[PDB]
């Protein structure tokens, strides 16, 4: 599935300098709604921009007044850019994405571990390790003795690993009594039935 | 700025001096692929992803070319206004829960990077380690700065201590985020 790209327009006419240009495609409710914006940045400062909702290039700063005017004057350029809403955004979504990103699913690897040695009747800490999963949206809960609990529980927010796999950790503040068995429960679209890990105290 | 998904189909970055460029594609925040400006070839993060879709490198090459041009133009339009450096902040963690002996991966997440030129090396007991290291591209940040990730494959053992050594111009001296299996 050949993917398409946005085309930067030509600018009109020891210290470091950084330039950056990007084509941002915003898909609200799948392809149903699409907002397209291109940003031209020179030293962390956005100076010109094309907002799908404005229909043309606009100067965000005075440093971008030249470029904006010239690109809007030349019909060829303006239409080229404008059309990218379909030729790039819609095309990639309905094509490469739908058959690659939008349809990739990775199942988590849950495992329960306890901080300090099992000290019966002595407060300790239990942690649920949900790792390696995609997409993002996921839920986690702690099952003590058949009863879910919220108090004394905390989970680090989504930890993006960078390799298209996410991660999250949930700590349980309890006390390992005798007999009772703890179990972590997590809901993730990468699976039909909530995966549940158990730990006999 | 709200939406269910956001694809950045075309991210071109160009620096001067040094004549440094980067061209990538991003989706929901992860990197789909990047064009190797030297090898003139596309490189997908997920090799499997490269099996399903495709992208002509020239698309990135032409852009970089345009970006390089405009950089020269804007540098003048603002009479050589230089870029103010930043102090990058690192963070280290394992890809999965650590279990002594069981091979894992150490991740260093460096953020607030600007300009996009940094050295990120790993240290094993204060010793420079090479093999087993994979570095990503520069990801884009809303404030137009950048962020990068580096990965190291190791064998969990209390017998060793690690630290991510970050070297950047915005730092008075190299910094290192220490991390141990303790």
């Amino acid at each position, epitope marked *: 599935f050949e993917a398409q790209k946005a085309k930067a327009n030509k600018a009109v006419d020891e210290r470091h300098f950084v330039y950056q240009f990007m084509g941002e495609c915003y898909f609200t409710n799948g392809t149903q709604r699409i907002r397209y914006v291109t940003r031209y940045i020179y030293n962390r400062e956005e100076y010109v921009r094309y907002d799908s909702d404005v229909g043309e290039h606009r100067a965000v700063t005075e440093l971008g007044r030249p470029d904006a005017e010239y690109w809007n004057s030349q019909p060829e350029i303006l239409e080229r850019t404008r059309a990218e809403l379909d*030729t790039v955004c819609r095309h990639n979504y309905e094509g490469p994405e739908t058959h690659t990103s939008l349809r990739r699913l990775e199942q988590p690897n849950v495992v329960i571990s306890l901080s300090r040695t099992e000290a019966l009747n002595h407060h300790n800490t239990l942690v649920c390790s949900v790792t390696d999963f995609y997409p993002a949206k996921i839920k986690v809960r702690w099952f003590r003795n058949g009863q879910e609990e919220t108090v004394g529980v905390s989970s680090t927010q989504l930890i993006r690993n960078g390799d298209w796999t996410f991660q999250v950790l949930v700590m349980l503040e309890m006390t390992p009594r005798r007999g009772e068995v703890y179990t972590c429960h997590v809901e993730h679209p990468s699976l039909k039935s909530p995966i549940t890990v158990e730990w006999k105290a | 700025i709200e939406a269910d998904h956001v694809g950045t189909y075309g991210i071109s970055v160009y620096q001067s001096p040094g004549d440094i460029g980067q061209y990538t594609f991003e989706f929901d925040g992860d990197e789909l692929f990047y064009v190797d400006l030297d090898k003139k070839e596309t490189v997908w993060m997920l090799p499997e992803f490269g099996q399903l879709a495709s992208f002509d490198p*020239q*698309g990135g090459l032409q852009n970089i070319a345009v970006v390089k041009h405009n950089l020269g133009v804007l540098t003048k339009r603002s009479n050589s206004t230089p870029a103010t450096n930043e102090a990058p902040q690192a963070t280290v963690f394992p890809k999965s829960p650590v279990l002594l002996g069981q091979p894992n991966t150490l991740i260093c997440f460096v953020d607030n990077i600007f300009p996009p030129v940094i050295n990120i090396t790993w240290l094993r007991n204060s010793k420079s380690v090479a093999d087993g290291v994979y570095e990503t591209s520069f990801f884009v940040n809303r404030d137009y700065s950048f962020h990068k990730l580096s990965y190291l494959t190791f064998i969990p053992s209390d017998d060793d201590i690690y630290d991510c050594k970050v070297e950047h111009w915005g730092l008075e001296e190299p910094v290192l985020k220490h991390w141990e299996p303790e």
Partner: T-cell receptor
Amino acid sequence: AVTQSPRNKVAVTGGKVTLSCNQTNNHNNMYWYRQDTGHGLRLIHYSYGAGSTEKGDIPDGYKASRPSQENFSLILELATPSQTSVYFCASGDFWGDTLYFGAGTRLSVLE
Amino acid sequence: DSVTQMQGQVTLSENDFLFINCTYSTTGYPTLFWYVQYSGEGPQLLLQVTTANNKGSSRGFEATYDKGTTSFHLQKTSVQEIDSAVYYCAANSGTYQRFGTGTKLQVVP
């Protein structure tokens, strides 16, 4: 505008030819096409700017060089008969959606 | 991305109807061009069309960007003897323009 030197030249097989091209109009991209019969125009090498050179559809046997911005030249080392034909250089702006050719160049690579 | 001029060579009497056929095939959204090359000189631009479905015309010629037929045929109503030359069809949905084989037009007085 754009001009090619030499306009025409003969060369012995195994030789070494160097086609030069120099355009006035500040164009970033430059191309080297080869005209024949039954193939019309075919791209050999192009360039997005100084220091740049990209492979066209038929790059085999040729080398390209973009030293300056206004100068792009095609280079044939071990020339062969199969490389005998007409060569048209072209300059144009980004994304090559607007290109201007030169007068042409007749090349004869005899056995 | 590839062009296809089925027209090997065309010859017709002055003030006739010229119709050179061209069919492309891309994976993108190419711009279509027509180049006229008069014997002796290099090829020059006649007309082009970036946006799909709509026609471009110049000095008596005109061609339509038909997506349904992936075609870009060249038309002329009163072909003068001056219009005798080689006509090239080209398309570019990337960084460089690819050309078709070519079609030679001989307009007899």
